Structures are given as C-alpha cells and as structure tokens.
Design a protein around this ligand. Structure first.
Ligand SMILES: NC(=O)c1cc(O)c[n+]([C@@H]2O[C@H](COP(=O)(O)OP(=O)(O)OC[C@H]3O[C@@H](n4cnc5c(N)ncnc54)[C@H](OP(=O)(O)O)[C@@H]3O)[C@@H](O)[C@H]2O)c1
Ligand SMILES: NC(=O)c1cc(O)c[n+]([C@@H]2O[C@H](COP(=O)(O)OP(=O)(O)OC[C@H]3O[C@@H](n4cnc5c(N)ncnc54)[C@H](OP(=O)(O)O)[C@@H]3O)[C@@H](O)[C@H]2O)c1
Ligand SMILES: NC(=O)c1cc(O)c[n+]([C@@H]2O[C@H](COP(=O)(O)OP(=O)(O)OC[C@H]3O[C@@H](n4cnc5c(N)ncnc54)[C@H](OP(=O)(O)O)[C@@H]3O)[C@@H](O)[C@H]2O)c1
Ligand SMILES: NC(=O)c1cc(O)c[n+]([C@@H]2O[C@H](COP(=O)(O)OP(=O)(O)OC[C@H]3O[C@@H](n4cnc5c(N)ncnc54)[C@H](OP(=O)(O)O)[C@@H]3O)[C@@H](O)[C@H]2O)c1
Lengths: 235, 235, 235, 235
C-alpha cells in the first residue's frame, strides 16, 4: 500500500502544497529544491504530524548533475517511485524586446530543461511501477499573454515535451497540470494575495491533485486546467 | 449546505455514474433523459440509499420544447440550481462519405444543440448561484480519428460552444469534461467491456468529477482530460 | 493543361473573387449558389473577357438533393474536377442565449453540413484527379469571439471535418482557408467597407489562393490564415 | 519600389530558395549564415543574374553578439528593412531519454533563441516600415512526433514566440511558415531526396512565400502550413 512521491520545487508554493496533500494520503515523500532549510522544516512537520516518511535533498533542476545526483539518492532511499511531480518553475514578465538573455535562459533551464531532466531521471522507475508523472506547466501552455513571451514559450515547449514523453512511454501516465494564477512566490511575489485579485490558493490545487491521484492505477489523467473565478476566462 | 445538481443523459453510463457520485456528497438531483423508467429506478434507489432528494422528468435534448419544459419543472421543484451536467451524447462511426444525413443530424442535435439548449435553459439560474456547468464532450473535442468525422466535428463544436458560454458569462463556471473511451452503451455497445480493451469505467469518471466539485466555489475547473492506460495516447 | 474548378458561394464575395482569379489562370469553372442571376452575369463576363469555359447551376448547400443534382450536372458538363472550393457560408452574431434555433440551424446546414455535402459529392472525382478541395472556414475555426458562439462552433466543426476528410482520403489535397474579416455581404453587410475598419478585400484572398494553386500537384497546402493589418491580432 | 529582405539560414535549403525567389521579384537582399563562402557564391550569382543588390555577412544566431553585429551591418548597408526571414534552424531526432544536453541546447539556441534574437534586432526597423517578419517553424509547431521531443518542443516555443511578438507589435506583420519535410540538409541529410519519399522541394516553398509576399502591404499572412502529398497527413 505504501507509495512514493517525488516533488520538485517542494520548498514553497504549489510543490509544498502538493507534498502536504499527498502526505495526508500517506505517501512517502522525496522533496527537492534549492532551499534545503525549507525542505527540512516541511519534512520534520509532515513526518510528525502525518506519520509519513520524508526524504529531502538539494536539487537545482537547471543543472544536469544535480538532477542526476538527486534521483540517485531518492531511488537509493526508497527504491522505485510511484509519482513524480515536476513542478519547479519561474516566470519573468516583460515585452520580448526587453526580456534579457539571462531571464530567458533561466526560464528555459527550469521550465523546460528542468522538467526534461526530472522526468528522464525517474523514467525507468516509473515504467516499472506504471507510475504517474505530473508536470506543473500553466494555463498558458496553450494560450498567449502580453509580457509573457519568454515564460509562455517555455510552457508551450513543456507541454510538447510532456506529450512526447507520453507517446514514447505508453507504460507511464503523464499528467499536465495547468493552473492559472496562484498565490505563491511566483513572479517575484509573496503569498498572502487575496483570491479576489484573481488567484487560486496552492492548497486548492493540491487538493485537486490529491483526489485525482486516488483514482485507480489504470486511469490516466492527462490534463487538468483550473483557474480562479476572479481570473478572466481567456483562451 | 444543500446544493442541487441537474444531470442530462442520467439514465445510464457516465450521467448515471455522476448522479450516484454526487448523491454520495448529498446533492439534491434533477435527472433527465428519454428513458423515464430508468430514471425512476435510479431515483428511488438514491433517495433511499443516499438519503438525497431526487426529481426526474422526461428530457429529449434534441427538442427545444422538451428542454424548456424540463428546465421549468426542475426550477419549480428545487429553485435555483448549483450544478448542471450537460452529458447526453451519442456517436455514429463511419467514413465521412458513408455517414448518413440522419446520423449526422442526430449527433448535431444532441452533442451540440442539446448542450446549447441545456446550458441556456439553466443559465440565469447558474448566474445567480455562481454555479457550475459541466459538459461531457470527449478527448476528441481537440483531436481527430478516422471514422469519427461526424462525431468529432460535433465535439469540436461543443468545445467552442462551452468556451464561448464561458467568455460570455464570467459569473458562471464552465467545466469541459473530456473522457476517452468509456465502458457504457455509447456507440451501440453495452457495459461490461474490460478495462484492458481500452475503457475507463463510468464510476471512475464520476469520482474524478465528484472530488473536483468539492473544491471551493471560487475555483473554476475548466478542463479535465482522462483516458484508460489501455487506450493509446493520441493527440 | 485544362483544369476544372468548382466553386460554391460563387455569386458574390470571396467565392466570386476566387472564380475571377482562377479564370485569369485559364481554369474552366463550375459555379454554384442560389442566386442564378448573379452566376449568369459573372459567367458571361468571364467567358468573354478571360476566354474560359463557365458552367453555372442553382445550388443550395443546405439541401442534400440540391448538392447531389449540382454535382451530377457539373460532372456531366466537364468530366472530373481538379479543384473544389467549398466556400458558401454565413454568420449570425448574438450572445448564445439570444441566438435563435433558426439562426443556429442555418449556420450548421451551410457552414458544416453544406461543406460535408459539397466535398462528398465530388470526392470520387478528386480522388481520381489527385485534386484539391479548398474550404473557406475562418480564422475563428481555431479561436473564440464574443457573440460568435453559433458561427464559431460551426467553423470549429468545419475544421475537424476537413481534417478528417484529409486523413480518410490521403490521395486528395485538402486546403483550409482561414480569412479574418473580409469586405463582402457576410454578416448582413454590403461591400464597400474600407480596409482601415479591419477588412481584407475578396480579390486579395483570391490572389493568395490563385498563386498557391499554381504550385505543383504534389504540394499540399493545408492551411492558410490571413487577416487585415487593421484587424487586431487575436488568437 | 525597392524593398529589402533579410534572410537567416541563407546558405542553403529553404533560406537559399527564399533568397532566390525574392530576387526574382527584385528585392535587395541581406543574407546571413555561418557559411560565408556559400553566401558569397549565392550573392554573386543573384547580383549578376537577377540584377539585385545583395549584402552578406557572417551570422551565428546562437550568439547574441553575432546577431547584433549582423543587424547593425545590414541596417547600415540598406537602411530599414521590409522583410525579415528568420529561417535558420536544425533538428536532432532521438527519444527524449537519449537526446543529449548538447543537442537540446543547440536546438533551443537556434530554433527558439535565434529566432527571438533575429526578430528583436530588426523589430524597430520593421515597425517603421510596417514590414513583414516570416519565421520558418515547422508543421510540428502544433503537433507531436516520436523522436521529435527536443525539436518539436523548440518549434512549439517558436510558435508562441512569434504570436507573442505579433500581439506586442500590431504595427508589424508576423508570418509563421510551417513546412512539412523538405529536401534539404536538415536532419543531417543532403538534397537530392525524391518527392515520393515525402519531401517538398525548397523552390516550391519559396514560390509559395514569394507570391504571398506580393500581396498588398495591408494584408497580414499569419500562417501557412504545407506538406508533400507523399507525407502522411498527421495532425
Ligand atoms: N503562481 C502562479 O501564478 C503560477 C501560474 C501558472 O500558470 C503556473 N505556475 C507554475 O507553478 C509551478 C510552481 O510555481 P509556484 O509554486 O507558483 O511558484 P513559487 O512559489 O515561486 O515556487 C517555485 C518553486 O520552484 C522551485 N525552483 C525554482 N527554480 C528551481 C531550480 N532551479 N531548481 C529546483 N527548484 C527550483 C523553488 O524552490 P527553490 O529552489 O527552493 O527556490 C520553489 O519551490 C511553476 O512551474 C510555475 O511556472 C505558477
Ligand atoms: N462511452 C464513450 O466511449 C465516450 C467517449 C467519449 O470520448 C465521450 N463520451 C461522451 O459521454 C457522454 C455520455 O455518454 P455515455 O454515458 O458514454 O453513453 P451512453 O451509455 O450511450 O449514455 C448516453 C446518455 O445520453 C442520453 N441521451 C442520448 N440522446 C438523448 C436525447 N436526445 N435526449 C436526452 N438524453 C439523451 C441517454 O439517455 P436516453 O435518453 O434514456 O437514451 C443516455 O443516458 C456523451 O456525451 C458521449 O459523447 C463517451
Ligand atoms: N466576410 C467575412 O468577414 C468572413 C470572415 C471569415 O472569417 C470567414 N468568411 C467565410 O467566407 C465564406 C464566403 O463568405 P463571404 O463571401 O465573405 O460572404 P457573402 O458575401 O455573404 O457570400 C456568401 C456566399 O455564400 C453563398 N451561400 C450562402 N448560403 C448558401 C446556400 N445555402 N447555398 C449555396 N450558397 C450559399 C451565397 O450565395 P447565394 O446562395 O447566392 O446567396 C454567397 O455567394 C463563408 O464561408 C464565410 O463564413 C467570411
Ligand atoms: N527540411 C525539413 O525537413 C524541415 C522540416 C520542417 O518541418 C521545418 N524545417 C525548418 O526549415 C528551416 C530551414 O532549414 P532547412 O533549409 O530545411 O535545413 P538546412 O538545409 O540544414 O539549412 C539550415 C540553415 O540554417 C542555418 N543555420 C543553422 N544553424 C545556424 C546558426 N547557428 N546560425 C546561423 N545560421 C544557422 C544553416 O546555415 P549555416 O550557418 O551556413 O550552417 C542553413 O542555411 C529550419 O528552421 C528547419 O527547422 C525544415
């Protein structure tokens, strides 16, 4: 009955919330992010309050060697994984002619290459377990926004990447999670922004994920798009 | 705390399963389909076993006057509705040059116009309650299949219709439900087909819907696509 | 060297313009629309001024029997056809709850079923000639507009229909033509509206089509989307 | 009457063919690629045979400083430009778990960032001239192929990028060119492959582009997708 979920970008925001939600269902957790202090704090709480096993380890998804070491340590700790949540991501918002090389490169390294690295590192394991890879892209993985050129392009790329992984690995389930705006640290912000300004809360997203992950193993949830009623419905 | 859900195509298949799932969460239900015998049977069971209120009434979504009378009777019974599940649908599968006028027309009347009629009939009510309209389209609302020309075209139309309703009514939540193949009577079949042949089971879809409908009222689930792991992942 | 093009909605607007453009390249033409007076007028002019053969015949694409008789007469006149332009279409623009049954039905009968009827009637002929079926859908075959629910849904359907025809008939070339707003009689208007209000001119669209149709027979133009620089770029 | 077209990836393949086609219409040309020997050869021929002005200069679109110097030299040579063809691109084809960091990075640098750099470098100029930016993406900018994960993801990104440029700069025309397979050096191949194996020829693509570029300045061709009849129609 014991299942193992790996979560990237677990130190805050959506990733943290998903960790907390899956802990409620008794998942063992492997948490990765650059802020190891945050991971430790979350881990100790979940271990004691939810009675689950938690492993955490430094992870920078922009670095090939970091992802490889992280996956090695996770697989060593738990054996094969059942769920991989490739959630780490970031956004800089500027007109395309104003966006810097540095900003564009960072979004590519995390939102696209980071996802690719995360999924390929755990792919053999998921194939064995008929597991589930959930990737947090964005509602903008299939639409456009002004000032979003760099960010949006990487999320469109991530959507193609996930679907290609799916075609190439029909023994694994790939789940594209497409939230609208969420009240996190995303975009250089901080949590505490009211729903009415057009924000979902991370715990809401995490509850949607948790209950969908309760579906039988032969159900493949491929796409979920959800936004605040206070976010204008744009396509 | 009492919420009311209206379900079309409630006599069997996905619609019936959604009715049963929402009954578990204590929804009052208004059931519509052409098979009133089936509706009565389902209703009596849910009333006694789940302790919910159930109203049922003949509904043929291919007829404007039937949908109008159905909505009148439902609103009279319950007052305003909180959830409307526009689920009735059907498919004939033939090469486009073989598909008959009759077959194409029926799919249009149910899959597209039936959805339109259902949503407009309850639209004022949903606007008042900040309610949720869930439309069962199909995974093929955004992809193509051979032999599916007539059916697919109506589901593409239904997707545009739902999104347009959403743009035009930002005070209402519209949820496009996109199942792959499901083991029902759909396509001239009968339930009992094994998952391994590439079928989801209706109760699985209904559980996904039920737990998503538990999200707070200010969360707008816009799209969910899910299929059997035994269905080839095609886009 | 003599090629035959069939054009529906040839009495005015884009269809007329395409007829005129193809006449410049020496196509024999078969023209269909309900306004036979208009067809005769266009035909006599093109015959004398462009030296091409022109056949015209009453065609109401909303009626199965009309399309069948039209195709019979065209094939009798010319033998097999090389190009079929399924261009007839219309739009009513209203919020979805205001759109009438009559309006929605007419758009379905012309924009979707009319296209289906036109293509299936000439399909065997095009298969023999490795011919080209061009369907005038709209830029809104893949996007949404307020007030466009009925119209847009039929164009989304038409796009699925065309692509399905293509999959099912890889020996024929299918070309989806997606103009933005064009200065015609479309939408209850009349020609003469200035480009600056956001309109392409029919002769511009027709020139784009004509020069693309000059490509070798083994080139399959599948999609062309074009709009006025004065139309806001929306996706 | 004299117009100036800048073409990247002009040393061979589609870029070269576009240069030759636009020369036939009397465009002055600015050619960029890494193979300056090839550019010189093409330039001398077009100058003498087509009587057009041709400027060429080393360009590596994977390097920010190269694109900036190239644009500086082009604008110095000609003044403002009327057409910018961002065509340079490449593909490596492997399952996603086999694709190397090096391969993925190169495709990103050329297919996505190279396009971004090219367009932003000439953006002020195009804004002044109400010019046209044509980007050669691919038919796979909106579909998936096995072994294409890295390549496809960059083309999906490029499509989002182009559309975002368009939204942000409605005074400029952006044209997404989406060829299927073409007989070039693409994919580590060489020209000479027969059409029947599923290849368009570069001169065909270039003719499609040339005749569309003859449309009046207030016509905005946004998308053209074309493939060989010998390429299976996939979406
Ligand atoms: N919030 C929204 O509005 C919105 C809208 C939307 O449509 C999509 N989404 C998408 O949701 C996902 C979660 O973002 P979210 O939770 O909202 O943002 P935030 O609170 O900033 O937490 C970011 C987490 O990522 C981690 N992280 C960052 N870089 C890393 C690296 N190199 N290596 C490893 N980890 C890295 C970072 O950890 P740390 O490394 O310790 O700094 C942190 O845990 C992203 O894909 C969004 O694109 C959001
Ligand atoms: N099963 C799949 O594989 C699959 C795959 C996919 O991608 C999408 N979906 C979509 O799922 C939805 C539910 O269909 P599903 O449950 O799978 O099919 P089935 O067991 O045949 O029950 C049909 C129900 O509709 C009702 N109904 C029919 N006509 C009616 C009318 N005129 N007026 C009112 N109701 C009418 C009919 O009731 P009755 O009137 O008494 O005969 C019955 O309750 C459809 O939208 C599909 O397109 C399915
Ligand atoms: N103009 C735009 O803005 C815009 C924007 C866009 O995105 C897409 N498009 C699409 O372009 C195509 C051509 O329309 P367009 O040229 O702009 O419109 P208009 O000047 O009204 O001429 C309509 C022609 O159709 C014919 N026709 C009508 N019903 C018929 C029937 N039952 N049977 C046979 N024919 C029928 C009618 O002939 P008649 O039968 O004699 O009355 C006439 O020749 C349509 O698909 C649009 O959806 C337009
Ligand atoms: N052929 C197909 O099948 C197919 C299918 C499809 O769907 C899309 N397309 C897309 O068509 C476009 C043209 O490619 P194509 O003509 O078919 O390929 P090829 O014959 O290899 O010539 C490549 C040209 O790019 C240049 N170039 C390369 N790197 C460069 C750099 N860093 N900086 C500057 N330039 C660079 C290179 O020049 P050089 O620098 O001297 O080596 C050469 O001139 C690409 O976007 C494809 O993705 C193709």
């Amino acid at each position: 009955e014991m299942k193992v979920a790996v979560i990237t970008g677990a130190s805050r925001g959506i990733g943290e919330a998903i960790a907390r939600a899956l802990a409620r269902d008794g998942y063992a957790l492997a948490l990765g992010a650059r802020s190891v202090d945050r991971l430790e704090k979350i881990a100790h709480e979940l271990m004691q309050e939810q009675g689950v096993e938690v492993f955490y380890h430094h992870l920078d998804v922009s670095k090939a060697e970091s992802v490889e070491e992280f996956s090695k340590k996770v697989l060593e700790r738990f054996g094969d994984v059942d769920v991989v949540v490739a959630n780490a991501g970031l956004g800089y918002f500027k007109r395309l002619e104003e966006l810097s090389e540095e900003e564009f490169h960072e979004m590519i390294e995390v939102n696209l290459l980071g996802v690719w690295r995360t999924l390929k590192a755990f792919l053999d394991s998921l194939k064995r377990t008929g597991g589930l890879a959930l990737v947090t892209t964005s509602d903008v993985s299939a639409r456009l926004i002004p000032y979003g050129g760099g960010y949006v392009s990487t999320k469109w790329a991530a959507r193609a990447l996930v679907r290609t992984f799916q075609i190439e690995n029909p023994d694994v389930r790939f789940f594209e999670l497409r939230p609208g705006a969420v009240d996190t640290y995303f975009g250089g912000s901080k949590p505490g922004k009211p729903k009415e300004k057009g924000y979902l809360k991370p715990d809401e997203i995490a509850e949607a994920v948790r209950c969908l992950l309760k579906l039988p193993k032969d159900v493949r949830v491929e796409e979920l798009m959800l936004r605040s009623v206070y976010q204008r419905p744009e396509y």
